[PDB]
Structure 1
Amino acid sequence: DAVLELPAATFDLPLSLSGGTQTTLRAHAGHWLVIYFYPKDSTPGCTTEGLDFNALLPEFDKAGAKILGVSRDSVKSHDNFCAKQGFAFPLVSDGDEALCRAFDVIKEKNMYGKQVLGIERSTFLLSPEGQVVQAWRKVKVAGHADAVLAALKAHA
């Protein structure tokens, strides 16, 4: 039932959060976890995605699920983003792209006559036992949080 196998070490990676604290994926054992990766703080599309998730938090709560947003922006950037938008869930500052690489969301595009890497918008649903049970890659923002919520409800 897993759609992705993560390196065992992934679950113990210390993840720097907005607010200045740290978590690990293992610390989330016992409940569903939505991990949504987005390319950049404070852009039109990534703001829309975050506000969409934020609007649905109570529905995520009803399933005991928690949300984590992830990009490679700094904690400070995350703090500003979260404050400005009123997010009620944490953002991981994956500055070294450790979590991104673990989920294989760093993708390459041949453009400008060179190989350019970047974060591909992607979302994953992690079971209470830490299994990746569903994945969405190259995500289109419109309707995404709704679809993730629906999928969560179906799995839970």
Structure 2
Amino acid sequence: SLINTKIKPFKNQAFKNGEFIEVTEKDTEGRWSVFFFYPADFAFVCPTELGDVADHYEELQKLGVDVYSVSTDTHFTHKAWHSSSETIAKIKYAMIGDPTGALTRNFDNMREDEGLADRATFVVDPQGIIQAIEVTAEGIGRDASDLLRKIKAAQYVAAHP
């Protein structure tokens, strides 16, 4: 488990609201971060999960939490996915491309014989420390409302040691 460790430095391209931006660990410092990994854009699997986090994106921003989705696809592919799927289209958070797999491996989350990330979610606090981890196989869905509870609880223990 990477629980209670500091995230490693990284530098990736991302797509966010119709534009390309670069993201590094410096963008996460002093912020709450959710890293949301998934295997592949354009898979026949319906992206319910990515869109649920999208639905909750408003509250997450009021709690000072940024959301980053990550797959080993490129940011170009993200822009195309964002254009063709109605569910993906409502995403307003950053979609990080990790074709080198460096970000994915930082989180020990690479399926090495497929070149894809596992279905993992990491909650990271402003000092870069990982406070929560959830991983599931392709049939077990990640519940975005459960994520919010965990994030809110994490902020609480930060305030009340």
Q: Deviations over 1:7-37 (max 9, x none)?
A: 7xx32x2111113221112222111000000
TM-aligned CA deviation for residue 116 of structure 1: 4.8
2:106 maps to 1:102: yes
Residue in 1 that maps onto 2:95: 91
Task: Choose the corresponding residue for 1:120, options 118, 121, 125.
Answer: 118
Taking a change above 3 Å as real, the CA distance of residues 136 and 143 of structure 1, as seen in their structure-2 partners, is: closer
Q: How many residues align?
A: 146
Q: How far off its partner does 1:94 sit?
A: 0.3
Distance 1:42 1:58, change over 3 A: same
Amino acid at match of 1:150: R
Query: Are the aligned partners of 1:49 and 1:141 in contact in 2 as well (CA < 8 Å)?
Result: no
- TM-score scaled by structure 1? 0.83
Q: TM-score, normalised by structure 2?
A: 0.80
CA distance, structure 1, for counterparts of residue 25 and residue 129 of structure 2: 11
Cross-structure match for 1:49: 49
Letter in 2 for 1:151: K
**Structure 1 unaligned spans of 5+:** 109-114
Change (3 A) 1:32 1:45: farther
Of 7, 11, 21, which residue of structure 2 is paired with 1:14?
11
Give, in whole Å, the separation in 2 of the partners of 1:34 and 1:82: 20
* Structure 2 residue 58 is the aligned partner of structure 1 residue 30: no
Contact 1:32 1:128 in 2 (8 A): yes
Helix, strand or coil: the match of 2:59?
helix
| Distance change (3 Å), C-alpha of 1:122 and 1:32 | same
2: distance between equivalents of 1:143 and 1:107? 19
Give RMSD over aligned pairs: 2.1
After the TM superposition, which residues 65-84 of structure 1 pair with which residues of structure 2 at under 5 Å, given as runs?
65-84=65-84
- Report the AA paired with residue 31 of structure 1: R
Give me the whole-angstrom Cα distance separating, in 1, the residues matched to 2:42 and 2:150. 26
Q: CA deviation at 1:117?
A: 5.2
Q: Which residue of 1 aligns with 2:127?
A: 129
* Worse-superposed segment, 44-53 or 93-102: 44-53
Letter in 2 for 1:134: A
Moved more, 116-125 or 62-71: 116-125
